[PDB]
């Protein structure tokens, strides 16, 4: 079952992905324990086999094609080595700007199976446990924004349950194939629909109400929600495991919140890869600070769409509504520069609070 | 507080909908009844409410 | 008798309702005491079996079909547990935007039977009693607008008397079947006619004069009024149990009054269900505040009828004479919005005060 | 997605033809049924759908 | 069913080659105007799956496909029972017809028509 689920999940992703010149799937056969040992026993963080293979060989090498995304066919529980492995993986993912996607174990929720997910009155109460100190600390870390955990399992204990990370990865690859960017990966109409599920019984192990989906999103998970009486389920949320910090200004709060969202983090990571490649090509050319700034602002302008009335399918093709690159010199070092790249994406609908009011006359707005 | 507004706070959904009465800047206008106190020769006594319905009952209880 | 009346009332409703793709009846077999126990013993208001089944499983679940209306085949007296049960039921009904309809017990009026309904000189005097403190408090509550109580019984103690809530529910389902909306459920010509009653003797236990019907309407009841010398009775009023608050402005008074009327509350609840479903479909799509406002105003426009000279059967098909949706952003939270939905229904005739004057010449108006 | 539009991307021909519904700026209008919940004395129970066809079956399963 | 399910990609099936590539997609070909399948399709999952794959091939080549509805699609042993149910639409609300309803919502289903009942030869 466990072996069959991994191979069948992989086969479904491979078969349903438009692989080609612009889209590649690369597979590393490795167990969870092997990854843990490799990451923990490395003499330094950049010496592990995973760091070499993911960062150095592609992102950090002339001519490499950086890993855009990492999918791990593993479940992560509350066990200390599970959280430690998640932390090491997040460090590698952050270094290479390659967001990591895996599955939440039911043991993370003190649950034998996700069939019990509707039982607790309050999910947030579970995560106050002393057994989840390390998990909360991980959520506080910067690099946790490069880890997303998906739940529950998806039908492919007598049924063949698969990791839903495969389904989310398929959403991402379909979004890239259709639009060239991976923002449109959530919602009924925004790219979050997982269609054609087996209809024997919930194909996602358990019904998740709107309120429970919102709870799970607040706790750092991406939940797959079965549409009742259908063969369809939807990723409504796209929250990474990162818990945004809370500030005293609206701008800081907004920026912290969006920097914890998988679509925007994927877009920012793609821009990191592009910047690495193009600026590596520019090393050694005659360039002032202004030359660098002009080049980078010219290059990024092609990905910006100002029209907020464009339909969903058009907005999916442009990751940015606004962008600006600021470049400064480093005193005492000719040809050495620092830059800040501001990316303002197109924002996806998260919540709506509505008040309905019967009136004899319409009040002014 | 309406139970709809409790769901604003306790595990709210993404799409949270409530019904409300549109009152603008209006203030509530509580009305007071007219109360006439009658003192007649007909600490433990009391002002008993009297009307056309119970008049004879009050007459009987006084029993002149 | 009591069992037969329930089954026969249910059978009549089922047989006379055009059930199908657009109209479903769902039945929960439960006693009044079981409802009381479930609602009182719940750890939290959202944990009761009734809350789960009515709110979470349909209104709060992806793909659910929200309950439009709830009918309770129960009578509610002045007893403290009766009013407590009414309050808890109102809370559940309000949460799901599903108005609840049941029967008033004669004990609420300190009567053994509604055959005594014409005896008291003044009905409002009854409801000043200290035994009705809890009832008056309930009438003051916001959620009481989701509870309507009908009276008296309808002929189906040697006669088989049934709950008139079945007859009102049948009016509602006929209105939906014919027009798609449930406003036209009152009056001789406005959908309040209950025809074909047994004619052996009042088929509604007691004749209710116009003045008495108006008293009952003012006290928060929907009375069924037999047309003398006929097999017909009419729901003239459609008032919920809510007592509207009185304000210092005409607009606030008008809004408070109509927010206590069953037809308008039903329409507003339907719009709540539609908004829940369509906006859930829009979660995750790229939407600005203006996108949301445009979409919602575009969507609601199809239910608006401007022509106040249209006949009754046309106005019955359009719940709105005017509508507007205002949407605002929430500072510091990208993709989070608040909306206000103003609904101006077509209003139904309630009262007419007329002065007849013989004149030798017509004065100017 | 229609298989016609898949051929837009996967080794497309020079002359690529698809069929499409002309909808302009229209929005889809999903309809909700009217659902009446009936509570009658006739966690484990459920709202069972009832209609003229299955009425007697529901009566039998309740078995009054 | 085997040819359509086991194809490595949608354009690699024998049916896709023969119907799309060899006529519609080849210089000098005479495109198939219409396809008729002497088959009946029931509510079974592989029946609806085959219908979906056939619809994809038919849509690609712009060649509408015509076949027969099985009485099993209506939960009927024979179409002699077709007049029995009070309401036909009620039958198609069944959970057993989730896949059929999804197929009806698909774009390429406009290239599939199902006829009924049988005709005496």
- The DSSP string of C85-131 is HHHHHHHHHHHHT--EEEEE-GGGGT-SSGGGTTS-S-HHHHTTSGG
- Cis peptide leading into E117, omega within 30 of 0? yes
Using CB atoms within 10 Å of the CB of residue C180, give its burial: 0 to 12 exposed, 13 to 18 middle, 19+ buried: middle
Compute φ and ψ for D36, nearest 5 degrees.
-105, 120
- Of A225, C98, A165, A258, residue with least CA distance to D38: C98
Question: To which residue do tokens 């007859």 refer?
Answer: C167
Q: Rounded to whole angstroms, how far apart are CA atoms A323 and A4?
A: 45
Residue from the list C14, C70, C274 with its beta carbon closest to the beta carbon of D39: C70
The answer to whether the CB of C225 falls within 8 A of the CB of C236 is yes
Q: How far apart are CA C204 and CA C222, in angstroms?
A: 13
C152 preceded by a cis bond (ω within 30 of 0)? yes
Q: Which of C176, C233, C178 is nearest to C25 (CA)?
A: C176
Given the DSSP bridges, would you call strands C147-151 and C320-329 parallel, antiparallel or unpaired?
A: unpaired
CA–CA dist A240, A190 (Å, integer): 18
Task: Count CB-CB contacts under 10 A for residue A195.
Answer: 11
User: CA geometry: angle at E74 spanning E69 and E79, to 5°?
Assistant: 70
Q: Partners of D34 in the beta sheet?
A: C23
Q: CA dihedral in degrees (E93, E96, E98, E103; nearest 10)?
A: -110
Q: Transcribe chain D into DSSP letters.
A: --HHHHTTTSS--SS--------TT--------EEEEEEE-------EEE-TTTHHHHHHHH--
Sequential DSSP letters for chain E? -HHHHH-SSGGGSHHHIIIIIIIITSTT------EEEEEEE-SSHHHHHHHHHHHHHHHHHT--EEEEE-GGGGT-SSGGGTTS-S-HHHHTTSGGGHHHHHHHHSGGGGGEEEE-S----
Q: Which residues contact A80 (CB under 8 A, 6 or more apart)?
A: A134
By the 8 A CB rule, do A191 and A185 touch? yes
CA dihedral E6, E11, E12, E15 (to 10 degrees): 80
Backbone angle region of D26, left / alpha / beta, with phi > 0 → left and psi within -120 to 50 → alpha: beta
Reported residue count of chain B is 64
> What is residue C282's DSSP assignment?
H
Separation CA E20–CA A19 (nearest Å): 22
Helices A80-96 and A133-140: angle between axes, nearest 10 degrees: 10
Task: Locate A118 and state its tokens.
Answer: 């509707």
Chain A residues whose CB is inside 8 A of the E8 CB are 15
With contacts defined as CB-CB under 8 Å, which chain C residues touch E89?
Answer: 20-21
CB–CB of A342/A324 below 8 Å?
A: yes
- Least Cα separation, residue A354 to chain B (angstroms): 5
Give the angle subtended at the CA of A74 by the CAs of A73 and A80, to the nearest 5°: 160
**The two structure tokens encoding residue B16:** 């949270």
Token pair belonging to A136: 């909360």
- Which of E22, E18, E16 minimizes the C-alpha distance to E4? E16
Chains A and D touch (3+ CB pairs under 8 A): yes
SS3 C293: helix
Closest by CA position to A232, among listed E107, C285, D3, C62: C62
DSSP state of C303: G
User: D–E contact (≥3 CB pairs within 8 Å)?
Assistant: yes
E10 CB neighbours in chain D (<8 A) are 3, 6
- The single-letter DSSP state of residue A82 is H
**E24, two tokens:** 């519609």
Q: Identify whether the C-beta of residue D49 lies closer than 8 Å to the C-beta of residue C67.
A: no
Looking only at the bridges linking them, the beta strands covering A233-235 and A222-226 are antiparallel
Within 8 A of E93 by CB-CB distance, chain C residues are 21
Closest CA to C175 of C163, C161, C187: C187
Residue among C2, C8, C206, C211 at smallest CA distance from C124:
C211
Residue C251, burial from CB neighbour count under 10 angstroms (0-12, 13-18, 19+): middle
Cβ-defined contact of E62 to D17 (cutoff 8 Å): yes
Strand partners, A343: A323
Given a contact cutoff of 8 angstroms between Cβ atoms, the answer to whether A358 and C343 are in contact is: yes
User: Which residue of E lies nearest to A232 if distances are taken between CA atoms?
Assistant: E102
Q: Which of A127, A128, A108, A110 is nearest to A119 (CA)?
A: A110
Tell which A residues from 160 to 219 touch C, by Cβ distance under 8 Å: 183-184, 186-192, 207-211
Q: How far apart are CA D28 and CA C298, in angstroms?
A: 11
Rounded to whole angstroms, how far apart are CA atoms E72 and E41?
8
The tokens describing C97, both together, are 């935007």
Q: In C, which residues are within 8 Å of D41 by CB distance?
A: 6, 29-32, 73-74
Q: For residues E63 and E32, is the Cβ–Cβ distance under 8 A?
A: yes
Give the residue from chain E lying closest to C24, CA to CA.
E90
**The sheet that has C147-151: what strands, in order across it?**
C193-194, C233-235, C221-226, C147-151, C100-104, C69-76, D34-40, C23-29, D48-50
Element holding A193 (H helix, E strand): strand A193-194
Long-range contact set of residues E12-21: C-beta below 8 Å, sequence gap at least 24? E13/E53, E13/E57, E15/E54, E15/E57, E16/E57, E16/E60, E19/E57, E19/E58, E19/E61, E19/E63, E20/E57, E20/E60, E20/E61
**In the block, which residue shows the tokens 């009438």?**
C139
* Residue A264: C-alpha distances to residues A174, A179, C18, C112 (Å): 17, 15, 50, 69
Answer yes or no: are the C-beta atoms of A88 and A39 closer than 8 Å: yes
Number of residues assigned to chain E:
121
Residue C49: its H or E element: helix C49-51
What are the phi and psi torsion angles at C16 (to 5°)? -100, 10
Burial class (CB in 10 A: 0-12, 13-18, 19+), A146: buried
**DSSP structural state of residue B24:** T
**Residue labelled with tokens 């008056």:** C136
- D16: closest CA of chain C, how far (Å): 29
Say if A and B touch: at least 3 Cβ pairs within 8 Å: yes
Q: Do B3 and C143 touch (CB under 8 A)?
A: yes
Alpha-carbon distance C99 to C241, whole Å?
11
Residues of C (190-219) whose Cβ lies below 8 Å from D: none
Question: B8 vs A215: CB contact, 8 Å cut-off?
Answer: no
Which residue shows structure tokens 């007459």?
Answer: B59
Residue A169 makes CB contacts below 8 A (sequence gap 6+) with A13, A69, A71, A101
Q: Which of C286, C308, C333, C341 to mutate to test the interface with A (most CBs of A within 10 A)?
A: C286
Q: Return the sign of the alpha-carbon dihedral for residues C347, C350, C352, C353.
A: negative
Contact across the interface for C72 and D58, Cβ inside 8 Å: no
Helices (H), ranges, B9-64: 55-62
| Bridge partners for A337 per DSSP | A329
Among the partner-chain residues E25, E56, E107, the one whose CB lies closest to the CB of D13 is E25
CA dist A165 and A152 (Å) reads 10
E54 touches chain D (CB under 8 A): no
Of A210, A357, A358, the CB nearest to B13: A210
What would the two tokens of residue C86 be?
């009414």
Residue A297 CA to chain centroid, in angstroms?
26
* Residues 72-101 in E contacting C (C-alpha not used; CB under 8 Å): 87, 89-90, 93
Cβ neighbours of residue C32 under 8 Å, at least 6 residues apart?
Answer: C74, C85, D41
Contact C181, C315 (CB under 8 A): no
Which ranges in chain A belong to alpha helices (H)? 2-15, 32-41, 49-51, 80-96, 123-126, 133-140, 165-179, 210-218, 250-258, 262-282, 289-300, 312-315
Three-state secondary structure call for residue C221: strand
In the A/C pair of chains, how many CB contacts fall below 8 A? 173
**What residue in E sits closest to D15 (Cα-Cα)?**
E25
Resolution (in Å) of the shown entry? Answer: 1.9
């Amino acid at each position: 079952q466990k072996l069959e689920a991994s191979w069948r999940g992989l086969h479904m992703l491979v078969k349903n992905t438009e692989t080609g010149a612009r889209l590649k799937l690369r597979l590393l056969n490795v167990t969870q324990k092997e990854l843990l040992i490799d990451l923990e026993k490395a003499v330094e963080f950049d010496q592990s086999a995973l760091f070499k293979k993911i960062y150095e060989e592609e992102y950090g090498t002339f001519g490499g094609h950086p890993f855009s995304l990492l999918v791990g066919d593993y479940s992560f529980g509350r066990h200390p080595q599970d959280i430690g492995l998640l932390e090491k993986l997040s460090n590698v993912a952050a270094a290479a700007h390659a967001p990591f996607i895996a599955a939440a174990s039911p043991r993370l929720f003190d649950m034998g199976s996700f069939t019990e997910l509707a039982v607790p009155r309050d999910l947030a109460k579970i995560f106050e446990s002393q057994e989840l100190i390390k998990w909360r600390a991980f959520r506080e870390s910067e690099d946790s924004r490069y880890v997303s955990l998906v739940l529950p399992h998806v039908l492919l204990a007598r049924y063949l349950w698969g990791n839903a990370a495969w389904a989310l990865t398929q959403r991402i690859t379909e979004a890239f194939a259709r639009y060239g960017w991976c923002a449109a990966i959530r919602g009924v109409e925004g790219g979050g629909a997982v269609e054609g599920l087996p209809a024997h019984k919930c194909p996602t192990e358990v019904a998740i109400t709107d309120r429970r989906e919102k709870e799970l999103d607040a706790l750092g998970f991406i939940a797959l929600c079965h549409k009742k009486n259908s063969d369809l389920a939807v990723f409504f949320g796209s929250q990474t495991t990162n818990r945004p910090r809370v500030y005293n200004t609206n701008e800081a709060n907004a920026n912290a919140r969006i920097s914890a969202m998988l679509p925007y983090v994927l877009a920012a990571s793609r821009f990191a890869h592009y910047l690495k490649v193009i600026m590596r090509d520019k090393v050694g050319s005659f360039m002032t600070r202004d030359n660098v700034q002009t080049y980078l602002n010219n290059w990024i302008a092609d990905y910006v769409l100002i029209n907020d009335n464009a339909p969903q399918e058009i907005k999916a093709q442009y990751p940015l509504r606004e962008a600006r690159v600021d470049v400064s010199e480093v005193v005492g070092k000719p040809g050495v520069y620092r830059a800040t790249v501001f990316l303002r994406p197109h924002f996806q609908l998260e919540e709506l609070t509505a008040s309905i009011r019967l009136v004899a006359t319409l009040p002014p707005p | 507080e309406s139970t709809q507004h409790k769901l604003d706070r306790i595990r709210p959904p993404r799409v949270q909908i409530t019904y409300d009465v549109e009152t603008g800047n209006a203030i509530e206008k509580k009305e007071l009844p007219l109360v006439v106190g009658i003192l007649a020769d007909l600490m433990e006594r009391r002002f008993v409410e009297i009307n056309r319905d119970n008049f004879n009952d009050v007459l009987a209880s006084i029993a002149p």
